[PDB]
Design a protein around this ligand. Structure first.
Ligand SMILES: Nc1nc2c(ncn2[C@@H]2O[C@H](COP(=O)(O)OP(=O)(O)O)[C@@H](O)[C@H]2O)c(=O)[nH]1
Ligand SMILES: *[C@H]1O[C@H](CO)[C@@H](O)[C@H](O)[C@H]1NC(C)=O
Length: 178
């Protein structure tokens, strides 16, 4: 049975747990899904192959710099997340998450994921970000960061609408396999 360990990282509130939840809920047959993910085993089928994806969430540990990395050994793929409603979350990709992940997970493939894409054209978030002299992340900034950090790929998604979620995990699975 092919098993791959997936760790999701990124700033607090950038949507890591909701992303795992939407994906996990999409499994068939339908199962009851918990609200915490550590070696959570999800079954996926990708290009005719059954894969056990063991999901680890760093939500709740984003400030535990010494404890969080204990989860990194044997990781096969990384979902590195920022939120499209938070340019600050994007800046932490090269400043915090990428040096960390490359240190503890050398040569482990990274999927760069822009969560909450439904917020890009959200009138309320535009207003809030404007108070800080910021605006939503544009797709091209996401793509350029992916190249900059050497990510396997860049994907945008919304856990709210579910758009792009499937494809995030398909890409992560292919990367873990390859
Ligand atoms: N609009 C929108 N909100 C989201 C999305 N994903 C998560 N959220 C909300 O953003 C907040 C943080 O999500 P969570 O998954 O707990 O982030 P975490 O801190 O990285 O685990 C919660 O209020 C979520 O309901 C999304 O795709 N779109
Ligand atoms: C399972 O999910 C429900 C929401 O769907 C939540 O109320 C419950 O606390 C969760 N149980 C566990 C063990 O995560």
């Amino acid at each position: 049975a092919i098993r791959k360990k997936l760790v999701i990282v990124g700033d607090g509130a950038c949507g890591k747990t909701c992303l795992l939840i939407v994906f996990s809920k999409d499994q068939f047959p339908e199962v009851y899904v918990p609200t915490v993910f550590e070696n959570y085993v999800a079954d996926i089928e990708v290009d005719g192959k059954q894969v056990e994806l063991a999901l680890w969430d760093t939500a709740g540990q984003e400030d535990y710099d010494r404890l969080r990395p204990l989860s990194y050994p044997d990781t096969d793929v990384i979902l590195m997340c920022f939120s499209i409603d938070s340019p600050d979350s994007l800046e932490n990709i090269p400043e915090k998450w990428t040096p960390e992940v490359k240190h503890f997970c050398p040569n482990v493939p990274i999927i760069l994921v822009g969560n909450k894409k439904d917020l890009r054209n959200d009138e309320h978030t535009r207003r809030e970000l404007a108070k800080m002299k910021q605006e939503p992340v544009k797709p091209e900034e996401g793509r350029d960061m992916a190249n900059r950090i050497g990510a396997f790929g860049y994907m945008e998604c919304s856990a709210k609408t579910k758009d792009g979620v499937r494809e995030v995990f398909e890409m992560a699975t292919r990367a873990a396999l390859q």
